[PDB]
């Protein structure tokens, strides 16, 4: 039983979406996977010696679950997940809703409404038009929004990631008070992934955190 | 700061070892890393749909920490770690000792005595001469012994992997009674790695467990 | 004189642009080059046997200058061209402008204004939100807008590409009446490139021309 | 319709040529394409900056039709072209005839007589035995002889390349007098290709023109 | 007739051996082939300019048969050769027998008994535990044991390689007395291969000959 | 001592030859080496099962020296060999002399006269214009003549290849009478190498021996 020839590592898309919607959903999913892979590599290279790990997860925490989450996002068997473009539950009629989760009856199914195709931006436009990681909402780009949607599925989240703190300040206090629960928090992982990507690639050596802190090479050891 | 050029992903060896000791220690270390890589790939492919995972870690456990442990073993920064072939602390004099951990003063160093160079075996002789995973000792091969030595180091173990169960029966009971401490038990990880390697590579489809269980393709779904 | 070692086939950018402007200008330039490359490949493969070539350049025209223009764009030498983000001529105050050519004194420099970073789009959103090649303006996307700035330059334009017909109807009339000037007209080449890219990649077999004409495999022979 | 899968870029040979005829003619046919590829690369790299372009096509002529002419030979569909070794029109009897074009009835077919397999030379022997580019006939080698046959075919010539000047002096006068017809003149292109190959590959930095001119690196700018 | 497709360059193994025996026999065979390849490369690089060649084959001998033998071992047609794990002649009952050749009736077949799977070593342990090329037996390792079996087969030995001198002293005397017969001698070839591998790879610059001699770079000229 | 980075496997040419003699001598040497490589591959694949081996070397001869000679020609250290275009011994004044060996004073030097650049053919014209391996001279092509010159050097011939039979009939009789001496005969090796190449590459399945024998696939077993 060669299981290396049956391994699917990309997110499937249903046939409800036409060519135009498929073209942009594929790019968004690929960008989300690229962000997750970079976060995994940064964690593996540094650990708790980097100042970004120490401020989102704890001063002396172990980096095993953190790398495992992004490893599951990057490489795993996505043979049951399906993304649909059809409103099968009558919920896109709400205000400001760009998608939703089908629930417990269909735990590996997600629906995308038409607001996503007009409001979401791409990774080449990061830290532009006044965007900052700590003062803007995390769902402005395709990568952050789709990462947030990934934690709901049964094959990725596995019913352990939840919402314990949502605002930036609450995330910062969770990092220092309850270090066990701030590795399974939805917002901490997305903040970390968005913060370490703008420091290595977008603006090397500076980033766009926008909260009044600057990190040098001497802080990484 | 281009940190992708300073990344060292192999285990450094000291100069106390002459040519014929280096020749064998390097091969042993490479085999241990290969075993870790295969275990991580199997876990990512299957998760809790595998009978081996289900029997060593729990019926409905989440696979995020096992993947992280094996990924830390495979790829991370091995710059502070050193393997020595010199008896600085004078402990190789004991009977049946093939090495030891230098302690809390030097938490990233370990000593290899001369017994390792006359007793340890290679991965091509697995499941031969009457060897079985569940009835023989785990340190007979280079890969298992070196995996056991890896968990002691501060840059890999991170002071979370301990000895909660040592025998096969205790390992099987702890997987069903206390599934939170099983993902950080030393022997459970090595048993899982050896079992899945013997099932996938050495004797494809049968394995060499030796306790009256046979698994088919229908048990993986 | 090994001239293959100092051959530059990419458009250089000045140091007056910061990181965020560089990140988007580079992507726009690469997209324009990719569009030109696809147009050249389609022309070489088919010639006057394709209906797009026939409708934009003439029924029995020869395809040599058309191939040469796109080949000059893709792979000429670009060591004296510069793109600047600095307003050195006080021309940004005019309403609606997104950039301009520096003139005949400096016949190889172009200035990109801050309006280009708010409105231009990317190739993955082609034929969406009601965009049609026939009825919309050519400078909505990065590639179509940047390709028209290349014909102004001395190295690429060579003072032979001019404005002989601007609207869609005039472009369609020039192709049939004056076939000699059609291959040197600025808008005809951009229309041809956009049409063939939309037909071959974005929506395979349909395109998004939006003027009531549909082409099948039998028109290509 | 995937038109990149059935793209033919070599010249087909009929079954009337036996083993040795095929062996020699295929090599002769590929050498001409190599010559055309080098000429195209030189034109793209320099343009009117090189002193070889200026003396054959004009002091300030634009280089797009030349690039297109050579790129048509290098890469284009050749599925309708056939080379035959059979004398069907009863013409391989005139003195000094090495082949002929089948005419307007079959405008994509060529016949090769038996003098070609006795009197044609290869590119490794260029500029030897007293051969000079300007003082010798242009059909002494396989590449130069096949290039002028390529211009007669409907698919590569397209009824635009003719004979407006045949000797070296007339070729040199046409460049300065009538620059519009120099770029579609049969002999100027072959002279240019031979010159730039001999200058760059055969005798690097000198060439074998043999007319009393020497060009240095200072002339190329 | 394409004879390059049905070309077998590895040694086939029969179905009498189960998985455990197959796993070790294949590794031994590939190690023997690697040793032969290194010996051929050393001979090609140096010839009679190396001190090992002059002492195993003669001071002024020609290296043609020597390189031919190892080239035959490395790459040839091993299509009629078979290795079996069954005892079809009842000869493994003798003491100290690790295998035998099936004889003249079956000239391309050989039997492997069970001692081979308990007493043979690997190339990573060369020159260790007191092993010495000059003083130990040549059949301790898999490679040196299988090389001696290769000379018995009809298609690798071809009825010319025999036993003329067995001990080290006899080999050293035959080298200088009869240089014609010491190029088709089993032990001479095996000793030469083991020595040039141990000098070049295992302990670079020193080797493990263990007979009171040592060579430097000044002896290779 | 890394001797793999100091390995020269091509034939050096002096600076006496100008730009146009180097171009042809280099190609001739490459073609000779390619012919030797093909002969080695044919010998390795078949041995004494092919009818070409059996008629030139013997009905049941062993193929070790034959493969070693061609292996020495293909890959060895050509660091003391030199080819010169300057007449130092005043011997080209003879008639029909295309080169000569410098003698025992300089055992690794060869001189090429000017007939070689006027009367030598290439491998793409084999079996053409009435050439047959059996009835024509062996020094008509670059490959055969240079192969003949290689056996004189002390680093390749090694003072064992001589002239024992020169005509085709004597060569045919030597194989049946004295098989020991027809493996170090100069003309037998050249006749074998030309014949197997003509049969395999030039005219697949037939060849151009021109003697009255035709070999089928059933003769190779």
Author numbering:
A (entry chain F), B (entry chain E), C (entry chain A), D (entry chain B), E (entry chain D), F (entry chain C): 31 to 251
What does the paper say about this structure?
In response to such conditions of low zinc availability, C. albicans secretes a zinc-scavenging protein called Pra1 to capture zinc from the host. Following extracellular secretion, Pra1 associates with the fungal cell via a cognate receptor called Zrt101; the PRA1 and ZRT101 genes are encoded at the same genetic locus. In this study, we present cryo-EM structures of C. albicans Pra1 in the apo-state as well as in the zinc-bound state at 2.8 Å and 2.5 Å resolution, respectively. The structure reveals a hexameric ring-like assembly in which each subunit is related to its neighbor by a 180° rotation.
